[PDB]
Symmetry: D2
Subunit: 208 residues, 4 copies
C-alpha cells in the first residue's frame, strides 16, 4: 500500500588500489565509500519524505516540494553516474588501449579515427566550466555518438540517451593526486578506460 523502492549501494568492481598509478587508492576509497555512498543515502532519505507526502503523513506546509524534487535529481544522478563510472574503468592491464567492435567502427565513421575522437573528447572535457562530467551518448534516432559536458550531476543531459563513455570531473575525482591539474588527470584516465564495458553498452541499443 503506497510504497516506493529505495536504491542500493553497489559494490566496487575491483580493489580500491586497482587503478593505480593513474588514480590513487586514496581517491577511490573516499570517492566510493564517501561520495557515492552519500548520494545513495541522500536519495533514499528524500524518497522517504516524498513517500510520506504522497501518503499524506507529511501535510502541506511541512515541506517545500522544489527542495525535495531538485534534491532527488542531484542525488539520484550522483548515484547512477558513479555506478556507470566504476564499471567504465578497468585495472591498468584490462583497461586502456583502443576500442573495438561496433564502437570502433562508429568512431571511425564519425570522427575519422580514434586519435581525432580522443582529441575532440579531451578538448570538450577541458572546456567544462567547473565541476561535472563529460559523456558520450549514443543517439538511436540519428545514430550519432554525441559528446556532451554535464554540469553538476544533472544539467545538460539529453533525455533518454544511454551513456557509452564517461569521465567524472568533480574536483574530488582527482584533487588529492593531481590538485588543480585537471588536464593531467584526463590524460591519465585514458589508460584505465574499459572499452569492453563501453562496447557492451552500445550493443545494447544497436538496431533496437
Amino acid at each position: 500500500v503506497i510504497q516506493l523502492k529505495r536504491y542500493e549501494f553497489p559494490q566496487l568492481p575491483y580493489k580500491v588500489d586497482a587503478l593505480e598509478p593513474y588514480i590513487s587508492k586514496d581517491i577511490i576509497d573516499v570517492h566510493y565509500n564517501g561520495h557515492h555512498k552519500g548520494y545513495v543515502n541522500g536519495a533514499n532519505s528524500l524518497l522517504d519524505r516524498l513517500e510520506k507526502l504522497i501518503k499524506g503523513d507529511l501535510p502541506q506546509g511541512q515541506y517545500d516540494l522544489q527542495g525535495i524534487l531538485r534534491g532527488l535529481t542531484f542525488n539520484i544522478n550522483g548515484h547512477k553516474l558513479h555506478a556507470i563510472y566504476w564499471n567504465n574503468m578497468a585495472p591498468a592491464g584490462k583497461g586502456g588501449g583502443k576500442p573495438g567492435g561496433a564502437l570502433a567502427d562508429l568512431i571511425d565513421k564519425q570522427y575519422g579515427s580514434f586519435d581525432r575522437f580522443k582529441q575532440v573528447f579531451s578538448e570538450s572535457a577541458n572546456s567544462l566550466p567547473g565541476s561535472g562530467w563529460t559523456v558520450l551518448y549514443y543517439d538511436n534516432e540519428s545514430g550519432n555518438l554525441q559528446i556532451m559536458t554535464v554540469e553538476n550531476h544533472f544539467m545538460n543531459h539529453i533525455a533518454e540517451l544511454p551513456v557509452i563513455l564517461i569521465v567524472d570531473e568533480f574536483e574530488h575525482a582527482y584533487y588529492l593526486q593531481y590538485k588543480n591539474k585537471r588536464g593531467d588527470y584526463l590524460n591519465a584516465w585514458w589508460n584505465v578506460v574499459n572499452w569492453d564495458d563501453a562496447e557492451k553498452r552500445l550493443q545494447k541499443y544497436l538496431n533496437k
Copy 2:
C-alpha cells in the same frame, strides 16, 4: 568519410485543431511549425559546425566549443521532448480518461490511486519555477515512476531514463489561450493525455 547524421522534422499525429477546446489550433500551429521546427533547424546548423570542427575545416580560434555543445543540448532536447509531447496527447475523444494496463497498476501501488497521482503530479507541475516541463520517468533500477520538473529543455533530467508522461510548461504552450493562467492549462491538459501512448512507452522497458 567523417559525417554526422542530421535530425528530421516529424509530422504532427493529428490536425492542428484536434486538441480543441483544451488547446487552441492557434497555439498548436505556431508551437509545431514555429518552435519545434526551429529546434530541428538549430540543432542541424550546430551539427554542421561540429562536423566542420571535427574534420578540421573549422580551425581552433574560429569557434567556442561551449557555445556549440550547450547549444546542442538546448536544441536537441527541444526537438526530442516536443516529439514525445505530440504523441503523448490525443484528440478529445481518444485522449483523456484514466490509465490502464501496467501503468495504472504501478500508479496504484506507488500513489495509492490515479486521483492522488493526479494531485501530486499537478502540485509538482505548478511548483516549476519558470519555463520547462514536468515529466514522469520510469526507473528500471528501482522500478519507481519518478516525477521531475525539468528547467528549460535540458536541466534536471535523470540520465538514461525513458519518458512515460510529459507536459510542456514553456509559456508558448498556453499563453495565447490561457495567458498567465498556467494552472488552468494544466487542468485542461489532463483531458487530452494519450494514455495508450504512455502505456506503450512503459511496456517497452518492463522486465527488460
Copy 3:
C-alpha cells in the same frame, strides 16, 4: 524581535498603453498586474516561512531549505528585474533615440559607435537560449560596460554589478503581440528605451 522586512509592489511609471504600438497594453497589463505582482507575493510568502524557521516556529523536518532559498532568488530577482525594466522604458516620444552623456561616451570608446553597440547587443539578446533577460552592467573595477544574457531571473548575473540597460526576454513579454517572433520584439523595444534612466544609473557609480 526577530523580523524581516517584506517587499512592496511598485507603481507603473506610466499608463499601461503608454508603450503602444511597440508593446500592446494587453501585454503590459498582465505583465505588470499579473507576473510582477506575483513575484512580490511569492517572495513575501517565502520570507514568512524563512522568518518562522529562524524564530523556531517552523521546526526541522517541516521544511526543505533548498526549496525556500532557491524560491527566493527566483522571486526576488523576478521582482527587482521587472522594477528596473519598467523604469528603463519610456513612452514613444520620451523614450527611444540615442544615448547621451557619459553613457554615450563609454559606448563609443568600447564599441566604436552606438550602431555597433546596438548590433552586438541585439546579437547577444538573440543568442539567449530560452527565457531570460539580456543586461548591460557597468563594471566599476575594469570600467567596462559588460553585456550578459541572463537565464531565467537568476542565472549568469555578475555579482554586485549595477544594471544600466535591460530587456525582458521571457515569452510573456512579447508573445500576445509578436508570438514566436522574438527578434521583431527586440527591434521594437529599441524605440521605447529610456536613455535618461540609463544615464542616471551610470552616473550613480561613476568615479565612486
Copy 4:
C-alpha cells in the same frame, strides 16, 4: 579606438600560511596562485576575443557568442568572488570572534542573536548541492541581510546586491585538508572570518 580593459590579479592580503591551522598553506597556495590566477587569465583571454568580435577582426562564423558570454560570467565571477573571499578572512588572531557595529545590530534584529545566525548560515551552507558559495547580501531595498547559496560561480546571485560575508564551497577550498568533510571545514572557517572587513562593506551601503 575600440578597447576594453582587462582584469588584474590582486595580491593576497597575508602570507599563504596565515590562516593555519584552519586552512593549510598548501590549500591557500594553489587556491590563490592556481585557481584565482586562472580565472583572471581566462577572463582576459575571452575579453580579447570579444574585443576582436566588436572590432570586426573576428568575423561571423568564427565564434560562438554563447561560449564567450557564458565563459565570461564563469571567469569574471570566479575572480571577483575570490577577491572578496581573501579580504573577508583574517589571520587567526585578527579574524574570528563576533561581529560588531551596525552588522552585529542587524544580525540581532533579524536573527535574534549571533548564535542563531551562525546556526542558520551554517545550515544553509551545508544544504548547497555540489560546488559553489554561500553568501550574505545586504538588500538596500528591504534592509534585509539575505542569505543565499550560489551554485558554481554564477548561479543564484541576486542582481546588484553587495556581498557582506562569503564562504567558498568548491571542493578545492578544503579537500586537501578536510577531504569530503565539508561540514568540518565550515566550522573551522568561522575562526578566520574578518568581521572588520564585513562591517566595512556594510557601512558602504547604509543609508545610501
